[PDB]
Ligand binder design. Structure first.
Ligand SMILES: OC[C@H]1O[C@@](CO)(O[C@H]2O[C@H](CO)[C@@H](O)[C@H](O)[C@H]2O)[C@@H](O)[C@@H]1O
Ligand SMILES: *[C@@H]1O[C@H](CO)[C@@H](O)[C@H](O)[C@H]1NC(C)=O
Ligand SMILES: *[C@@H]1O[C@H](CO)[C@@H](O)[C@H](O)[C@H]1NC(C)=O
Ligand SMILES: *[C@@H]1O[C@H](CO)[C@@H](O)[C@H](O)[C@H]1NC(C)=O
Ligand SMILES: *[C@@H]1O[C@H](CO)[C@@H](O)[C@H](O)[C@H]1NC(C)=O
Ligand SMILES: *[C@@H]1O[C@H](CO)[C@@H](O)[C@H](O)[C@H]1NC(C)=O
Ligand SMILES: *[C@@H]1O[C@H](CO)[C@@H](O)[C@H](O)[C@H]1NC(C)=O
Ligand SMILES: *[C@@H]1O[C@H](CO)[C@@H](O)[C@H](O)[C@H]1NC(C)=O
Ligand SMILES: *[C@@H]1O[C@H](CO)[C@@H](O)[C@H](O)[C@H]1NC(C)=O
Ligand SMILES: *[C@@H]1O[C@H](CO)[C@@H](O)[C@H](O)[C@H]1NC(C)=O
Lengths: 304, 214, 221, 181
């Protein structure tokens, strides 16, 4: 829209107001769009007894494909955008610009895998807020999409060959970050809430939970055409906008189908004091701010 | 609230024949409808749910149908253990405000049988305690509908008696009925003759057993 | 397959409160939802409320709202019903029931509204009357009729047998009625051959457990 | 220099407090930087640690700024130093687990011996002091033993383990049989 020259701008994608603002707008939307039969939130104000707050309401079944949402500048501010084909989110960017709104973003709620997102324009790209810290999330962005086909009848499908090529590119990128002599190893999730241990996502209004062990079980730099993930649909859900629980009614349709493109991943690295040289990576996620950061890394909002 | 209403109140079926019960709702409840069976002194028993699904242990001769605001339950060939009270339930609304119909009593249909009428004056022991009750018994009759009336010295009585009725007898399919007139020692001795006039389909003329004090 | 077993009969003054219980055994407790349904003498079934055991959330009928509470103790597989500010019209048999909802501990929950497993029922009588035993009077006599008038007792139930159980043929024990005095009353009659009067004796046996009373009245020609 | 003592098979709660009353990111680690447990948004994660199965938190307090590490069914192996990372700041707490058992399982006769044996993490000298129901006092390091039991020793013994100026109490039921003359 409006380009700039002879101007340097320091970005910091791990300290971005747009990410927080978007997180609330999204919550508000899901909150009001898909309503639970019962809502449970903890309330422990009193020093002693804890009081669970309960809400019961009419819960109509609803399903439609999330419409792209845009972020636009609030009165007083402006949106700068970095145009470097491969920008890591931090430091100066001279190929900068100012825009009305951001690009169209699908407000997808999911873990482990990022769906229907933006692709890297050149090579596969990995990004973190602190790589040496094994607790911080590693966001992968792919340069090629991978289909994942899911059905309410209990499974998801991925082509093995396509997924294997993808793993090769991530491992390649990973070992470049942690030492060119390291062995890259993908393992299943190590534990936690169901929404975190499985590849969790929403589809036709129903919450799916898919065992992703088969996607994360290989060793790099040391047979069956499609990979079929077992899945469950669930009625009792852990909240993601805050701490609590939600119950929905059982499905009313017998033909729930989701085709999606895997455009990125969320990983966590094992780490830990080990003179043995090999890094272990497991699927991660849970904080949707990471999901939003993978789309907004190239934006910042500045006062006019 | 959603009102459930069953028809009819009482249904008389001859053994081995088909019976049809209906349940109606004041608004659509989809297929969230269940039928229960209950026998005197026992808990209810689930028969059908989802409008038309038999519960475990339920025999094939039971079957339910319908959706929305209209439901029926069919027993294709009544056995002895099929005669009971049947209840329908809706559980469609949310928040849950589930409701039941007032039930349909399903009893055995037999030939008309006249009651044999008896009458027991108050006992000495009772009279000695200040009170006096007179009992009029209608034994082994069908159908259930009977009309009793107390007359004290050729005078209609009102509000001073009570009725009790047994369940349909498992062997002969009849009913029995007791009617107790209650008076004080003083009122009792104020009059002469005590009678119970009895009307029943099995009687051409209303029958009257009686007695005189002393 | 769960078995539901409720606590014993209760007797309360109006204005009191009651807490009835129901022990569930045989299956995984948190996979069942439980419901309470009551029934007044000679009346139909009434849904009182339902607890979602795994979430610990309960819902109640509008006309009970405010004076009824259902809870669940996971450590002993027990479900409780509390009814506050009791009235005489709360007199009823109170039933505990439940149904399987699925692999709830894994997030599967069907939310079934129907009731598959029932307890034996708990009679709760709400009255101003006091506990007291029946007075037993004779109903002195084809064939002939004879019986026992069981009058003025509280509360239900009362049991009647003849000749210590040896006489059962042709016996009718009527259901109780509520007298205007607030006390119960019933008659038990039996029909025997006329020639049996003068040779075979007839004693009626009245047991009323609440007052720990027991009477054997002889009926004679 | 925060020290907490644990008991074999028991449960402990290692506390963590944020300077504000909100729910932010936190993570528990051990001295080897192995991830034990932390959060991601409103969900709980668990690392590839030997504790995985037996580790938990209390999410009904996260919004109150409390992020505890509950370890159930404690083992001696669990002994380590645990670090709570939150809002760019490290809370450090050391955990020592002890166990205390008798030489035999079954009942003892009068005049028979009793040996209590204390189990400990490598590198740590604790003092032990046990007292019988009659007042019999014994002390030592690894192993404590009474040469001759009296009938009056039957009942609950109370042992106290001293370490890092902190203590913790154990209760053991010894039965000593009576007999006819
Ligand atoms: O809660 C009252 C509500 O229940 C209904 C139907 O379930 O009637 C039930 O409760 C009545 C109140 O005692 C009983 O008399 C009746 O037999 C029973 O079915 C509705 O009538 C009412 O709205
Ligand atoms: C981000 O890219 C910049 C280029 O400006 C590079 O210098 C830097 O290494 C990258 N980020 C960091 C701090 O690792
Ligand atoms: C994707 O990026 C990888 C490097 O990680 C590169 O080798 C490959 O050619 C890229 N694919 C496309 C289509 O650009
Ligand atoms: C990244 O994490 C490591 C250890 O977890 C820490 O030492 C380092 O300071 C962190 N990076 C920054 C600059 O915050
Ligand atoms: C997923 O579905 C698409 C069409 O929507 C199909 O072309 C693709 O091959 C499928 N991939 C599988 C089955 O893994
Ligand atoms: C990736 O998996 C494929 C299965 O299609 C298999 O050929 C191979 O083991 C893997 N790739 C490489 C480079 O070995
Ligand atoms: C996923 O499947 C693998 C093998 O089928 C199993 O070992 C693992 O426990 C499963 N994960 C979950 C979340 O159950
Ligand atoms: C990965 O999967 C294979 C079977 O496909 C299994 O044999 C192997 O044990 C798994 N790897 C591990 C050790 O997690
Ligand atoms: C996935 O990616 C392919 C290739 O670009 C695209 O044509 C297809 O429509 C995508 N599938 C879905 C369901 O978005
Ligand atoms: C991804 O986009 C496809 C294409 O319309 C849509 O069908 C699918 O529902 C989307 N997946 C999710 C989880 O939103």
């Amino acid at each position: 829209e409006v380009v700039l020259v002879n101007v340097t701008e320091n970005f910091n994608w791990c300290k971005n107001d747009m990410v927080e603002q978007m997180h609330e707008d999204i919550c508000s939307l899901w909150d009001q769009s898909l309503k639970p039969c019962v809502k449970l939130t903890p309330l422990c104000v009193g020093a002693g007894s804890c009081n669970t707050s309960v809400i019961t309401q009419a819960c109509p079944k609803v399903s439609f494909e999330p419409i792209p949402i845009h972020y636009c500048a609030p009165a007083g501010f402006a949106i700068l955008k970095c145009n470097n084909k491969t920008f890591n989110g931090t430091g100066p960017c001279t190929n900068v610009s100012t825009v009305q709104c951001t690009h169209g973003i699908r407000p997808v709620v999911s873990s482990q895998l990022l769906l229907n997102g933006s692709l890297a324009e050149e090579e596969v790209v990995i990004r973190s807020c602190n790589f040496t810290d094994n607790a911080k999330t590693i966001i992968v962005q792919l340069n090629t999409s991978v289909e994942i086909n899911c059905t309410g009848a209990g499974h998801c499908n991925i082509a093995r060959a396509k997924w294997n090529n993808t793993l090769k590119q991530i491992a390649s990128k990973l070992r470049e970050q942690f030492g060119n002599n390291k062995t890259i190893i993908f393992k299943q999730s190590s534990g936690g809430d169901p929404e975190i241990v499985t590849h969790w996502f929403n589809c036709g209004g129903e919450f799916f939970y898919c065992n992703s062990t088969q996607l994360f079980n290989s060793t790099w730099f040391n047979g069956s055409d499609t990979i079929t993930l077992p899945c469950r649909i669930k009625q009792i859900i852990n909240m993601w906008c805050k701490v609590g629980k939600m119950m929905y009614a059982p499905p009313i349709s017998g033909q729930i189908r989701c085709s999606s493109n895997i455009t990125g991943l969320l990983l966590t690295r094992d780490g830990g004091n080990s003179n043995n040289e090999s890094e272990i990576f497991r699927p991660g996620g849970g904080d949707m701010r990471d999901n939003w950061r993978s789309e907004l890394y190239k934006y910042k909002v500045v006062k006019i | 609230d959603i009102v459930m209403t069953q028809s009819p109140a009482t249904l008389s079926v001859s053994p081995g024949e088909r019976a049809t019960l209906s349940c109606r709702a004041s608004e659509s409840v989809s297929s969230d409808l269940a039928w229960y069976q209950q026998k005197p002194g026992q808990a209810p028993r689930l028969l059908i749910y989802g409008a038309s699904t038999r519960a475990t242990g339920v025999p094939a001769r039971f079957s339910g149908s319908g959706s929305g605001a209209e439901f029926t339950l069919t027993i294709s060939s009544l056995q002895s253990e099929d005669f009971a009270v049947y209840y329908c339930q809706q559980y469609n609304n949310w928040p849950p405000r589930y409701t039941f119909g007032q039930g349909t009593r399903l009893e055995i249909k037999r030939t008309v049988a006249a009651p044999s009428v008896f009458i027991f004056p108050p006992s000495d022991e009772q009279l000695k305690s200040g009170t006096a009750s007179v009992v009029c018994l209608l034994n082994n009759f069908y159908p259930r509908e009977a009309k009793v009336q107390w007359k004290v010295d050729n005078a209609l009585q009102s509000g001073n008696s009570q009725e009790s009725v047994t369940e349909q007898d498992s062997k002969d399919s009849t009913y029995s009925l007791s009617s107790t007139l209650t008076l004080s020692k003083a009122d009792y001795e104020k009059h002469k003759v005590y009678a119970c006039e009895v009307t029943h389909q099995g009687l051409s003329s209303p029958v009257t057993k009686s007695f005189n004090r002393g | 397959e769960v078995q539901l077993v409720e606590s014993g009969a209760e007797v309360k003054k109006p204005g009191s409160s009651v807490k009835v219980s129901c022990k569930a055994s045989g299956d995984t407790f948190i996979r069942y939802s439980f419901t309470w349904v009551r029934q007044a003498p000679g009346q139909g079934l009434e849904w009182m409320g339902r607890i979602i055991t795994i979430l610990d959330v309960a819902h109640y009928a509008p006309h009970l709202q405010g004076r009824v509470t259902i809870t669940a103790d996971k450590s002993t597989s027990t479900v409780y019903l509390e009814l506050r500010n009791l009235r005489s019209d709360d007199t009823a048999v109170y039933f505990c029931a439940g149904v399987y909802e699925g692999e709830a501990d894994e997030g599967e929950y069907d939310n079934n509204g129907f009731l598959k497993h029932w307890g034996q029922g708990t009679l709760v009588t709400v009255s101003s009357a006091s506990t007291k035993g029946p007075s037993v009077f004779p109903l002195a006599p084809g064939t002939a009729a004879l019986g026992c008038l069981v009058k003025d007792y509280f509360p239900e139930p009362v049991t009647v047998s003849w000749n210590s159980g040896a006489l059962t043929s042709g016996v009718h024990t009527f259901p109780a009625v509520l007298q205007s005095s607030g006390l119960y009353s019933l008659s038990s009659v039996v029909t025997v051959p006329s020639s049996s009067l003068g040779t075979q004796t007839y004693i009626c046996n009245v047991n009323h457990k609440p007052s720990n009373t027991k009477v054997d009245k002889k009926v004679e020609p | 220099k925060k020290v907490v003592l644990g008991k074999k098979g028991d449960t402990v709660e290692l506390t963590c407090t944020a300077s504000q009353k909100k729910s932010i990111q936190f993570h528990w680690k051990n001295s080897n930087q192995i991830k034990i447990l932390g959060n991601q948004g409103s969900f709980l994660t668990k690392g590839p640690s030997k504790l995985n199965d037996r580790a938990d938190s209390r999410r009904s307090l996260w919004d109150q700024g409390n992020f505890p590490l509950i370890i159930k069914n404690l083992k001696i192996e669990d002994s380590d130093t645990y670090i709570c990372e939150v809002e760019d700041q490290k809370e450090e707490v050391q955990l020592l687990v002890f166990g205390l058992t008798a030489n035999s399982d079954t009942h003892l006769l009068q005049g028979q011996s009793l040996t209590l044996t204390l189990e400990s993490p490598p590198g740590s000298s604790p003092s032990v002091q046990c007292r019988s129901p009659r007042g019999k006092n014994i002390q030592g390091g690894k192993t404590l033993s009474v040469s001759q039991l009296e009938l009056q020793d039957s009942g609950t013994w109370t042992c106290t383990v001293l370490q890092n100026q902190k203590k913790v109490e154990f209760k053991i039921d010894i039965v000593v049989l009576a007999f006819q003359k």
